[PDB]
Design a protein around this nucleic acid. Structure first.
Ligand code: MG
Lengths: 390, 1285, 49, 147, 36, 49
DNA sequence: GTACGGAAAAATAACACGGCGAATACCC
DNA sequence: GGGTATTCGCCGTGAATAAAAAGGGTAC
RNA sequence: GCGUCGCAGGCCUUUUUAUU
RNA sequence: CCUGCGACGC
């Protein structure tokens, strides 16, 4: 059909031709020459060469390059036949069927968001206004502020005050699909909740950078917007970052802390043989935090803190105990981050990287999935807080 | 010290003295184009060789001949400044004088006239080419040198690990002749990688018999027959490596018994015995091979043929015939192998004609064989000058590999050349020989602009002489002139094809002078006749030991082409044949001399060269007993009285871009590679800022590039302005006739190739003495003649709340408020008004169906005003097309700016509008002022001469000279006005083209890519306020907070040394500023600056302030109040102890770490942090040019899919890996929505849009259109595929 | 974009997919080598029927 | 002997970097773990390993050739003090080899991943228990040195 | 993360050996040879 | 369909033309091409219901 | 300045590895 | 002379995207 | 809340650079 | 056939 091989116009006025149109023109011209020569009762020698040229023209139209030499026109390059549009990387399968270009998508440079949670990300307002056009149009037509769709389009293009309120209303519980360019496994496309920020960069959580394998030296990521209820439920239940905490290749976690968090938790949980406030009895972790923030006790000082740890060794219920531990000031401050089900022997040592990894493993093994996300978020928060004070 | 360097002297660390100045960096392409473009006799390089290799032209026995006499280049109609603003090619007309003779012999009439054959583009003095207004750079090529090479299979084939050798002859132009082996030990030959043949076929094709073949490749063993006992000739060297199966007997003495091994003591006994005739039994003779044939003088029959085994019956037949001497062949297994014997046994051909038939059948498949056709084909392969040719370097490399004394010869091959190549291949196979490296720089040449231009001119000239011969065959003479035979179409076509659309002809990066000076000095292994970037291999990408001083190892792009795109070194040059060379100081036995010698790659391996940084006793001897040197691709410790040469400098190994990194030896090679790659991507800011920690090579980059205004003649500055600088030339450099002044027109705000702003700012004052070579205007990224690629700010290395998590950079708000990273980007919007049917197009301002609010910015001519802040969706050039329809030029959505310049180009027949008249009036006013300056200077001089003669024919003579000068100036003004109003050429069918330029200022923001000079890149995450940044006890906040976590992992310690040295330099600058702020005298300031310059141990700077005046010391102090620049060399850099002394010179601690207080809370940090100054750079990876978003838009025609790209408002591509990641989940509805509704289904996406607008989240799957296109395309191939139901 | 046309050839032609793609479908059905069919189709040899 | 010298240099550097402290408890000194930033960033596992500290403080050691062999003259200096030209030109071989290997591995990795996906795209869990008795015998793999 | 470019045994600990798939014959010196 | 979309489309389509193959989807890649729910995850429950 | 589109010179150009099928040469 | 069985041609394969130019019919 | 009139657009191949 | 623009009817 002619729409599958069109003749495009140019600015100069000359209509440029394609490869298939040239091959079809060659085949039709050779067939017309053969018919005109057969009408005039030619001898066999000329019509044998004419039938041979028609055979070569048909073979060049079907698959140019198999038999003989591929014909070149004005470019010293082989022409495209009907078989070149099906096979190869630029065929209809790998370029138009297996991988396509989709709507409701964007792309920007990623940055770091320390204040974000594990299930949310920072989305710019200039991208959220473009990716959520018909939702804002439907909400403006429902609220009655714009009866005509052209009035709603002009209200969005003018960027009025209620447009940002509608955009904040249609984004609160609508997830987006963030994706990096090399997708080696299934953790390269995760779902997050958009947070309207000011700027042109995407704020990414620091804990998902190990799963994404993306630092912040110029990396870019693509966003996608689900529209149907089934797609939103598949993003919330299957593709959410809080649901993918174990790798399906071997079972190891993918929410391991990076260098700044383990550096802060290593500097906080250490001790020296002589410091300010060494050798005093403390009544709890709140007095340790008060003595650290008041400037009367160092972060590395061997003290005696009365702790209250819980243990769930019974049939589901938790049993409490109270004793005097020989610990430091920073480990008591980190003990407020640790939940009730975990013991005290996992925090009384110097926290490296595998120690925090096995701490998160023990928390996910004993408590479950829901406190583990809050524990990892609070660990990242206190690591970023105590790496700056050092 | 010149007048430019005396304004601000950079403190130069380093202990090694410089015995050789840094040469001109862009001299390679300039010297190549000078060798190509100049007039040179004796048939050497240039256009003369191309004209002599073609002319004279002979006809087919027509008694006619067209020969070449001389050529002459014309003058360009416009210079470089006008071809860029007009859009034409800066070329020159070629005028060649030919001569046509005719014989009956003798001649009867000679026709001589000048013939014009195309135009060739000239090279700018900076080293560029103007093709269509833009500047291009022809990249040099790195290809294999012509000659002969021997390689090894290294055991890949045959799966047994057997090593196979081969030999190939690569000419400069012609067919290939490759020789190969067999695991069955058979020598083969293949031409142009076709089906292989035995080498005896091409031997017999060169008129060789079997006896001559066995004579050339084997020795003769005389086997004579005596009366009895079967004597034979014995050579004692032939029995080495062979067992003794029989008893060796001679003259009754026993030497070696039966079954005894031959030891060298028995060989020495055979030497001492002096015997050559032993007894051999009959069973040993049958294992030999006969050499030639034997015929009977009485019978006359063929007993045995050549190259066959011996038997007892044929031995008896030679015994009865009376053949005394029998010639055999010597066959061994270590030194002489029977390869040619098995090659003759494999070859079924036994004639020259059959060999020619087989060669014709191999080269021409499917063709009827003919003896004359095979004779014409075999002669036109390696023995015809037209089809085959070897250069002088090819003949030199061919004769050097075969151990020949002569280096001269012909371009075609011969019989003895192929014989010597086969002999060398046989000796390599036997063991006496070795293969050579392909990666060696002595086997690789370097092409340039002139050689490729000469090759394209030769292709054009042979097409022209083909057309001339075909026109001379059909026609007569004595009625025409030699102008119609010469057609200037193929020469101009080949020249425009080479200069316009080529793999090595690319645009020059115009964002930095360093990017230009590294793109011009670029060596590429790709191109026509080179390698391929995806099929190169591991062995060609690594760095060779012969790359020392010739190819930089740390300057290559990372990605698809690593090691294929190399950069030239600083002191590296090019030989006469095309090989690389580096200078070496000649070291005699008495003293290390200073005379340099350019050694090539082959000459480097013979001598031994000491290290670059080897300390001496300042007289010329080595203070160490053993010094580290290199002899043949390896480093070792050598004696004192063993060296022959020495490195001339310590910067000869790195390139120009790699020598701008201070403390390079303290960084890893990967981080240095990343820093040298990212140093070329910087964007110039509003104001240039000098580096506090530099090297000293910045002035060479700023001067050798064409970005600054270098004064041609010294003198006194007469008139200073922001657009022009007038220089009054002194009488010492003035010409004796028509003395004048120099006028430098500064290049103001305009668009470069990378959509950036290039601008020249003046740096001189009124009445300032300048010298020859001093700069007058500072271009982009240039500060007082240095290279200022970025800004230097107060830096700190500490984590700040996770805002510098992986690579992120925390920038303060004072960096944004001072606008020190604001860049100017200029775009170009054109409006082509073409001539079509139904009347032409007009640029009238009366545009229908638009309000007057859009026409308020347009003038009466229809063009937008200069200086109007336009936005997205405004009419710039009002254009209508008669059917009237509207086709005016509008601003695209998303871009904006300010109109700064409008250029209007019109044809000769079309009447110009008011804007073109205003532009021509402004250009005529500028030319009138530029002529009137010299006019009033000469008028003042002539009136001074009138007053001199005054206090009567001399007055009349001077008045006649005054009227002659006025007439000459009027003629020059009329010529300039005619050159202005000469007109411009356009495309056929185009009336006029109007171009609008938009300028915008892009500030810094979170998302931009920042980097340094040590490979430490990052993206800004948050712009922090000034009250939240950490501060010291004095209250000075930090501008940039960096993360120290990347320092142990990525080993780049040079950034911390640069930080400490910049902190010391800023401390010295703040002490100078504190001394200058209070009222201080000149003596204390002078002695403080002298004490600051005298710091260092055994430095070679030696600045003495006794020769400086008080105004010069005050100007130097005002230039040093912002910081003292420090020159830290590449490997001769400053040590840590000198940084300690420089920190003790100020009020700063030696450790470089100070305590800081928090800005948010106010408490002191527990540990001191490293606070200093680091030269930062802003790359061309801004976030406003990368952010894109799309809900709905346009779709394609064939496959109903969204478009691709930001400029077309396209969408992102959901590739196959994202589909696999969605299939790895249970997300089936999301993949169905991505594949059908969001991409393909038109009815599905319209129903989905209507449902989302109405408020329903429900979709219909439908059928994708791409599957229907696939079904229609498979169905057109004659295959029936359909969906059944 | 869905309607097609046809070209009535004056002489029959062989399909290149069922001839050149190894193994040859015409060469295996007729039990003939590919070179002889290439000589017959491109007018270089005769064949008796 | 150069490998033994490099091992002794690394051992002395690690022994100098472990304690590095003479601090008084009440009036007498006592050794403790160092609070150096390099040792704290290399010991906690944040960024960098022991080989990075060996190349930053001790000698770099033996370096290989592009042909595959090892140069007998090693790099007796680190990145803290000044390297000469030969010790940089030696390390450029390994840097270029690593960069070329990283640049050329990705096409083969993508081709292998594409072939594995297209050969294993049609295996979906459809049942719960087919009722079979076949199976493989799980044993720990032993090569001869250790498990 | 992978790569692309190209007489006597000693025990580690104390334990009894286990010889499987071996056919032997007792010699005169008291050693143990393998005929498999 | 899965054999032609991966590699060597010409010989696979030639064998499918000379053999007369009837291709049920029964998989992921065949359902990707025609644009419907794959038999995996929620699409498996859709195919079951 | 409108009109058949081919094949022979072009002073053409020239990858490594692997699987499958055909011409052809050994071995009784 | 039938059954092998090495050789030698030939075809298929060689990651994934964003920007910026240049050319879309040359002859007699 | 839609339909009629007019304008602009839907490309292909090759080369170079940059990023992951 | 789909987008965006300008105009008009009930
Ligand atoms: Mg990155």
């Amino acid at each position: 059909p002619p729409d599958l091989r069109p003749l495009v116009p140019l600015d100069g006025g000359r209509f440029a031709t394609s490869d298939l149109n040239d091959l079809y023109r060659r085949v039709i011209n050779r067939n017309n020459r053969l018919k005109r020569l057969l009408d005039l009762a030619a001898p066999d020698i000329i019509v044998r060469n004419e039938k041979r040229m028609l055979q070569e023209a048909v073979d060049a139209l079907l698959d140019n390059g198999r038999r003989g030499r591929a014909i070149t026109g004005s470019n010293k390059r082989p022409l495209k036949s009907l078989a070149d549009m099906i096979k190869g990387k630029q065929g209809r399968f790998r370029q138009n069927l297996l991988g396509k270009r989709v709507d409701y998508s964007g792309r920007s440079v990623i940055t770091v968001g320390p204040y974000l949670r594990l299930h949310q990300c920072g989305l710019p307002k200039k991208m959220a206004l473009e990716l959520f056009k018909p939702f804002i149009y439907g909400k403006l037509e429902l609220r009655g502020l714009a009866t005509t769709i052209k009035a709603a389009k002009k209200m969005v293009e003018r960027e009025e005050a209620v447009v940002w309120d509608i955009l904040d209303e249609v984004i609160r519980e609508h997830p987006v699909l963030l994706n990096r360019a090399p997708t080696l496994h299934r953790l390269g496309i995760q779902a997050f909740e958009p947070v309207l920020i000011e700027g042109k960069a995407i704020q990414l959580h620091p804990l998902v950078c190990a799963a994404y394998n993306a630092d912040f030296d110029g990396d870019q990521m693509a966003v996608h917007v689900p529209l149907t209820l089934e797609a939103q439920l598949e993003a919330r239940a299957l593709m959410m970052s809080t649901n993918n905490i174990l790798s399906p290749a071997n079972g190891e976690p993918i929410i391991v802390p990076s260098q700044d968090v383990v550096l802060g938790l290593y500097y906080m949980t250490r001790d020296c043989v002589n410091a300010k406030g060494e050798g005093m009895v403390l009544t709890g972790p709140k007095e340790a935090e008060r003595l650290y923030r008041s400037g009367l006790a160092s972060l590395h000082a061997r003290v005696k803190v009365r702790i209250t740890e819980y243990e769930k060794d019974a049939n589901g219920e938790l049993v409490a105990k109270t004793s005097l531990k020989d610990t430091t000031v920073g480990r008591a401050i980190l003990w407020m981050i640790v939940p009730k089900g975990l013991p005290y022997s996992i925090v009384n040592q110097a926290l490296g990287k595998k120690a925090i990894s096995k701490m998160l493993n023990t928390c996910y093994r004993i408590l479950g999935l829901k406190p583990t996300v809050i524990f990892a978020d609070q660990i990242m928060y206190t690591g970023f807080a105590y790496a700056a004070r050092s | 010290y010149s007048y430019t360097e005396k304004k601000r002297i950079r403190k130069d660390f380093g202990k090694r003295p410089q015995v050789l100045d840094v040469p001109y960096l862009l001299s390679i392409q300039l010297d190549s184009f000078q060798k190509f473009i100049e007039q040179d006799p004796e048939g050497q390089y240039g256009l003369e060789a191309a004209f002599r290799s073609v002319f004279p032209i002979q006809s087919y026995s027509g008694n006619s001949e067209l020969q070449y006499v001389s050529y002459r280049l014309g003058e360009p109609v416009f210079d470089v400044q006008e071809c860029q603003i007009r859009g034409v090619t800066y070329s020159a007309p070629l005028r060649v004088k030919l001569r046509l003779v005719i014989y009956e012999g003798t001649v009867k009439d000679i026709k001589e006239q000048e013939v014009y054959m195309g135009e060739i583009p000239l090279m700018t003095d900076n080293g560029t080419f103007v093709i269509n207004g833009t500047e291009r750079v022809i990249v040099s090529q790195l290809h294999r040198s012509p000659g002969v090479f021997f390689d090894s299979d290294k055991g890949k084939t045959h799966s047994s690990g057997k090593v196979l050798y081969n030999a190939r002859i690569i000419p400069y132009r012609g067919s290939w002749l490759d020789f190969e082996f067999d695991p069955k030990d058979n020598l083969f030959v293949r031409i142009d990688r076709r089906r292989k043949l035995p080498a005896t076929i091409i031997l017999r094709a060169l008129n060789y018999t079997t006896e001559q073949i066995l004579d050339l490749f084997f020795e003769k063993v005389i086997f004579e027959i005596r009366d009895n006992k079967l004597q034979m000739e014995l050579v004692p060297e032939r029995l080495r490596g062979e067992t003794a199966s029989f008893d060796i007997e001679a003259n009754g003495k026993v030497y070696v018994e039966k079954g005894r091994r031959i030891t060298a003591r028995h060989i020495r006994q055979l030497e001492k015995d002096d015997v050559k005739l032993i007894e051999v039994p009959v069973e040993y003779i049958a294992g030999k091979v006969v050499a030639k044939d034997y015929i009977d003088e009485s019978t006359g029959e063929l007993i045995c043929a050549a190259n066959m085994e011996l038997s007892l019956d044929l031995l008896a037949k030679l015994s009865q015939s009376g053949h005394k001497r029998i010639e055999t062949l010597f066959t061994n297994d270590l030194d002489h192998g029977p390869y040619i014997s098995e090659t003759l046994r494999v070859d079924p051909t036994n004639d020259r004609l059959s060999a020619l038939v087989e060669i014709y059948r191999m080269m021409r498949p499917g063709e009827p064989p003919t003896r004359e056709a095979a004779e014409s084909l075999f002669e036109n392969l390696f023995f015809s000058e037209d089809r085959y040719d070897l250069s002088a370097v090819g003949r030199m490399k061919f004769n050097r590999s075969l151990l020949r004394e002569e280096i001269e010869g012909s371009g075609i091959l011969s019989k003895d050349d192929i014989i010597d190549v086969m002999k060398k291949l046989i000796d390599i196979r036997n063991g006496k020989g070795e293969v050579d490296d392909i990666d060696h720089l002595g086997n690789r040449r370097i092409r340039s602009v002139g050689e490729m231009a000469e090759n394209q001119f030769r292709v054009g000239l042979v097409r022209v002489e083909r057309a001339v011969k075909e026109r001379l065959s059909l026609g007569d003479l004595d009625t025409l002139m030699p102008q119609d035979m010469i057609n200037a179409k193929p020469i101009s076509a080949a020249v425009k094809e080479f200069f316009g659309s080529s793999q090595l002809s690319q645009f020059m990066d115009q964002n930095n002078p360093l990017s230009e000076i590294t793109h011009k000095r670029r060596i590429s292994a790709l191109g026509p006749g080179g390698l391929t970037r995806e099929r190169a291999g591991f062995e060609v990408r690594d760095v060779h030991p012969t790359h020392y001083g010739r190819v930089c190892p740390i300057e290559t792009p990372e990605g698809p082409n690593i090691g294929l795109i190399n950069s030239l070194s600083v002191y590296a040059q090019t030989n006469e044949y095309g090989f690389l060379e580096t200078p070496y100081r000649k070291v005699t036995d008495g003293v290390v001399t200073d005379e340099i010698h350019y050694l090539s790659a082959i000459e480097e391996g013979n001598y031994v060269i000491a290290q670059a940084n080897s300390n001496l006793d300042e007289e010329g001897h080595f203070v160490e007993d053993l010094v580290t040197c290199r002899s043949k691709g390896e480093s070792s410790l050598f004696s004192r009285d063993q060296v022959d040469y020495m490195d001339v400098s310590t910067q000869q190994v790195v390139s120009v871009g790699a020598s701008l990194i201070p403390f390079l030896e303290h960084d890893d090679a990967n981080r240095a590679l990343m820093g040298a790659n990212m140093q070329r991507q910087a964007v110039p800011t509003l104001r240039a800022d000098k580096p506090l920690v530099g090297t000293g090579m910045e002035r060479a980059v700023a001067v050798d590039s064409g970005v600054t205004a270098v004064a041609k003649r010294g003198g006194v500055v007469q008139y200073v302005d922001a657009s022009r600088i007038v220089i009054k030339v002194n009488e010492d450099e003035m010409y004796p006739g028509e003395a004048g002044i120099d006028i430098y027109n500064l290049t103001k705000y305009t668009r470069s190739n990378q959509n950036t702003c290039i601008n020249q700012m003046p740096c001189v004052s009124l009445g300032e003495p300048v010298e020859r070579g001093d700069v007058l205007a500072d271009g982009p990224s240039t500060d007082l003649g240095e290279l200022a690629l970025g800004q230097n700010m107060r830096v700190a290395f500490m984590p700040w709340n996770g805002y510098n998590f992986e690579d992120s950079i925390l920038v303060s708000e004072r960096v944004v408020q001072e606008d020190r990273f604001t860049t100017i980007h200029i775009q170009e919007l054109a409006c082509v008004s073409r001539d079509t049917k139904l009347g032409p197009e007009e640029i009238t301002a009366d545009i229908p169906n638009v309000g007057e609010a859009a026409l308020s910015k347009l003038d009466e001519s229809g063009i937008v005003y200069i200086g109007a802040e336009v936005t997205g969706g405004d009419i710039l050039v009002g254009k209508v097309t008669p059917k009237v329809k509207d086709s005016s030029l509008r601003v695209p959505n998303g871009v904006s700016g300010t109109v700064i310049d409008v250029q209007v180009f019109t044809r000769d027949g079309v009447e110009k509008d008011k804007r073109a008249l205003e532009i021509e009036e402004m250009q005529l006013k500028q030319a009138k002022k530029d002529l009137s300056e010299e006019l009033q200077i000469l008028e003042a001089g002539l009136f001074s001469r009138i007053r001199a003669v005054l206090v009567q024919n001399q007055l009349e003579q001077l008045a006649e000279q005054y009227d002659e000068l006025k007439h000459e100036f009027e003629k020059k003004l009329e010529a300039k006005r005619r050159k202005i109003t000469q007109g411009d050429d356009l495309a056929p069918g185009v009336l006029k083209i109007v171009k609008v330029y938009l300028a915008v200022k892009r500030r810094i923001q979170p998302g931009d890519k920042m980097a340094g000079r040590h490979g430490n890149k990052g993206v800004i995450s948050k712009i922090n306020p000034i009250e939240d940044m950490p501060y010291d006890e004095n209250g000075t906040p930090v501008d940039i907070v960096l993360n120290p976590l990347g320092v142990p992992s990525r080993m780049n310690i040079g950034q911390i040394l640069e930080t400490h040295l910049g902190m010391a330099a800023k401390g010295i600058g703040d002490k100078i500023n504190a001394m200058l702020k209070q009222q201080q005298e000149v003596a204390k300031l002078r002695e403080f600056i002298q004490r600051a310059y005298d710091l260092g141990a055994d430095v070679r700077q030696k600045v003495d302030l006794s020769t400086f005046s008080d105004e010069e010391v005050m100007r130097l102090a005002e230039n040093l109040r912002k910081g003292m620049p420090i020159a830290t060399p590449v490997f001769d850099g400053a040590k840590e102890a000198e940084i300690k002394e420089l920190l003790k010179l100020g009020d700063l601690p030696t450790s470089g770490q100070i305590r800081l207080y928090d800005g948010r809370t106010g408490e002191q940090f527990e540990r001191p942090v490293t606070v200093g100054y680091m030269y930062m750079l802003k790359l061309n990876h801004l976030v406003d040019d990368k952010m894109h978003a799309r809900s709905t838009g346009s779709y394609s025609l064939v496959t109903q899919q969204p478009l691709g790209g930001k400029a077309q408002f396209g969408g992102q591509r959901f590739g196959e890996m994202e589909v696999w990641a969605l299939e790895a989940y249970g997300a089936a509805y999301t993949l169905q929505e991505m594949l059908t509704v969001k991409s393909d289904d038109v009815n599905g996406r319209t129903k989905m849009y209507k449902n989302i607008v109405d408020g329903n989240h429900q979709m219909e799957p439908g059928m994708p259109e791409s599957f229907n296109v696939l079904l229609k395309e498979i169905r057109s191939l004659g295959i029936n595929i359909e969906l059944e139901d | 974009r869905e309607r097609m046309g046809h070209i009535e050839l004056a002489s029959p032609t062989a399909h290149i997919w069922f001839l050149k793609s190894l193994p040859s479908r015409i060469g295996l059905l007729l039990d003939m080598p590919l070179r002889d069919i290439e000589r017959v189709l491109y007018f270089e040899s005769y064949v008796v029927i | 002997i150069w490998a033994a010298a490099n091992d002794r240099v690394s051992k002395a550097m690690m022994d100098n970097l472990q304690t590095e402290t003479v601090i008084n408890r009440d009036g007498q000194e006592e050794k403790q773990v160092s609070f150096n930033s390099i040792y704290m960033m290399a010991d906690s596992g944040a960024r960098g390993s022991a080989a990075q500290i060996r190349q930053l403080a001790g000698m770099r050691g033996l370096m290989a050739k592009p042909d595959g062999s090892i140069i007998e003259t090693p790099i007796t200096a680190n990145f803290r003090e000044g390297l000469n030209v030969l010790q940089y030109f030696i390390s450029t071989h390994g840097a270029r080899k690593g960069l070329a290997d990283t640049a050329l591995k990705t096409a083969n990795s993508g081709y292998l991943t594409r072939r594995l996906v297209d050969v294993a795209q049609d295996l979906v869990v459809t049942e719960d228990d087919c009722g079979t008795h076949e199976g493989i015998m799980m044993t720990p793999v032993i090569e001869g040195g250790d498990v | 993360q992978l790569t692309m470019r190209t007489s006597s045994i000693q025990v580690k600990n104390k334990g009894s050996i286990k010889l499987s798939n071996v056919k032997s014959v007792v010699n005169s010196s008291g050693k143990l040879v393998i005929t498999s | 369909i899965s054999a032609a979309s991966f590699q060597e489309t010409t010989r696979v389509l030639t064998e499918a033309a000379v053999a007369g193959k009837r291709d049920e989807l029964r998989g992921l890649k065949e359902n990707v091409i025609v644009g419907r729910l794959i038999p995996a995850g929620t699409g498996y429950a859709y195919h079951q219901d």
